[PDB]
Copies of this chain bind each other. A is one copy, B any other.
Amino acid sequence: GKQLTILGSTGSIGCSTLDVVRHNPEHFRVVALVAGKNVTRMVEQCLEFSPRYAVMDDEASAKLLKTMLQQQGSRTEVLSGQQAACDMAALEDVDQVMAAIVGAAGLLPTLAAIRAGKTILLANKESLVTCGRLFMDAVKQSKAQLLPVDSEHNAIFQSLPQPIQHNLGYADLEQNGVVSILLTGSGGPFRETPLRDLATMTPDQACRHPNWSMGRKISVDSATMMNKGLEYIEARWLFNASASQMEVLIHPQSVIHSMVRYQDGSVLAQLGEPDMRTPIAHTMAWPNRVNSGVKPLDFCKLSALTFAAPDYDRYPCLKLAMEAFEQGQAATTALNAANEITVAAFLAQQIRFTDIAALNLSVLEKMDMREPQCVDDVLSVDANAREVARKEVMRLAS
């Protein structure tokens, strides 16, 4: 059995991950769980998976969790703080780490697992957006095995050749016969909407994700294709791909999750249901497979599969992301930060749907900062981008 520590175990990814171990108790053993302040869910997971440690990101939560565990008779050792999270990610005993702590808080714990040479199940896919160079370098200098969890990068991973799967990031694409990586996205709810109407779209309309449902923030990123922009940035880093080795394709049905084009003309693709348990189960079991609880894709109950090229006038964020990648990590993390501010603003009805792209671009222009050399530097750029975005949102709605 493989032992693991789950960074951000109470979130959607963590729960799905735990569902997978529940489907394969013999194969997986939970050594440590780390979360934020959701004490109630953490108690249940502790009582259900018997981890050696449980870490909350706060003293009040740790004590409150420690009280309920003992009241229930559990002997799980409780801890709190970022440093503890990092220790769990580096436990001598654990084989793989599910990195699901989103945002800046997930940076160091994920980095800690990389240096420890663990097998990383990268769910915190946004960390490559800010620390792409830092992370891939650390990955190569420790031989840690990266296994992308997000649906798109996972599909690509599965469609990639073995020599690349192992040595992910520091492997040569052209040398393994790979022509390009085909990143796919639904195009959002405003795929066929008249451009002239994009400015009047409402938060409710923007949050109607085409197929499956998800958070409001990630729904809007899907409508602006900023999510495809961030994933593009991540892919480049994760698969050592150039601009000419990347292709973005709209696929409304989202049956195909992404593909890889090969030298001889072949295109390999991964398909399935929109259940995160599939990519998650894939990474956990790699190089083998395990039951994930996800039902088999029924090809007789599918909508006709179509494709199309992304129109940049309709998705400026997508072009904006590609441009930032060429600009550097300072640009990508600023774009990410700004977008986080403008999307929240749009959702709070402070700005129009179309202002998201305009304001994201405006923040990038004003930035012009020194490429971060460490996480703390990444943090500063981020902090500076959010305030610039906040000011623009304010001077916009004023």
Q: Does A198 contact B (CB under 8 A)?
A: no
CA distance A281 to B264 in the complex (A): 6
Check A262/B289 contact, CB under 8 A, given A268-B159, A297-B267.
yes
Q: Are A307 and B297 in contact (CB under 8 A)?
A: no
The answer to whether B269 touches A265 (Cβ under 8 A) is no
Q: Report if A196 contacts B (CB, 8 A).
A: no
Say yes or no: A177 contacts B289, CB within 8 Å.
Answer: yes
Please count how many residues in chain A sit with their CB below 8 Å of the partner chain's CB atoms: 51
Query: Which residues of B are found within 8 Å of A273, using beta-carbon distances?
Result: 265
Q: Are B277 and A158 in contact (CB under 8 A)?
A: no
> What is the total number of copies of this protein in its complex?
2
B267 contacts A270, C-beta separation under 8 Å: yes
Contact A272 B282 (CB under 8 A): no
- Quick one: which of B259, B289, B290, B296 contacts A271, CB cutoff 8 A? B259
Q: Is A275 at the interface (CB under 8 A from chain B)?
A: yes
- A278 near B297 with CB under 8 A, answer no
Q: Name A273-330 residues within 8 Å CB distance of B.
A: 273, 275, 277-279, 281-282, 285, 287-292, 294-297, 299-300, 302, 304-309
What distance in Å separates the Cβ of A276 from its nearest Cβ neighbour in chain B?
10
Task: Flag A351-362 by CB within 8 Å of B: 1 or 0 each.
Answer: 000000000000
User: Within the complex, what minimum Cβ distance (angstroms) separates A250 from chain B?
Assistant: 9
Q: Contacting A302 at CB < 8 Å: which of B162, B179, B279, B307?
A: B307
Decide: B308 and A306 in contact? CB cutoff 8 A. no
Alpha-carbon separation in the docked complex, A300 to B287 (Å):
33
Write the nearest CB–CB distance from A165 to chain B, whole angstroms. Answer: 9
Whether A367 sits at the interface, judged by CB under 8 Å, is no
User: With A259-B271, A271-B259, A309-B300 given, is the CB distance from A294 to B264 under 8 Å?
Assistant: yes
Residue A47, interface by CB 8 Å: no
Decide if A294 touches B309 in the complex (CB within 8 Å): no
Asked whether B296 lies within 8 Å of A265 as measured between CB atoms, the reply is yes
Measured CA separation A270–B287 after assembly (Å): 20
Q: A243-273 vs B: 1/0 string, CB under 8 Å? A: 0000001000000100101111111111111
Task: Select A263's contact among B182, B275, B290, beta carbons within 8 Å.
Answer: B290
Bound: A307/B158 CA distance, A? 23
A161 sits at the interface (CB 8 A): yes
A300 adjacent to B307 (CB under 8 Å): yes
Question: In the complex, A290 Cα to B266 Cα: how many Å?
Answer: 11
| A176 at the binding interface (Cβ < 8 Å) | yes
Q: Across the interface, do A177 and B288 meet the contact criterion of CB distance under 8 Å?
A: yes
Q: How far is the CA of A282 from the CA of B267 in the complex (A)?
A: 12
Contact of A307 among B259, B265, B290, B299 (CB under 8 A): B299
Q: Which residues of B contact A158 (CB under 8 A)?
A: 266, 268
Name the contact of A308 in the complex, choosing from B179, B263, B275, B300 (C-beta under 8 A).
B300
Residue of B nearest to A278 (CB): B265
A46 to B159, CA, bound (A): 39
In the docked arrangement, what's the CA distance between A262 and B271, Å?
10
Taking CB atoms and an 8 Å cut-off, the chain A residues in 150-194 that contact chain B are 158-159, 161-162, 176-179, 182
Given contacts A269-B270, A300-B309, 11 further A-B contacts (CB under 8 A): A176-B288, A262-B289, A264-B285, A264-B291, A265-B273, A266-B278, A268-B270, A300-B308, A302-B306, A304-B304, A305-B306
Q: What are 30 pairs between A and B in contact, CB < 8 Å?
A: A159-B268, A161-B287, A176-B288, A177-B285, A178-B289, A182-B299, A249-B299, A249-B300, A259-B271, A261-B297, A263-B289, A263-B290, A263-B291, A264-B278, A264-B285, A264-B289, A265-B272, A265-B281, A265-B295, A266-B278, A266-B279, A266-B289, A267-B270, A267-B272, A267-B296, A268-B269, A268-B271, A269-B271, A299-B307, A300-B307
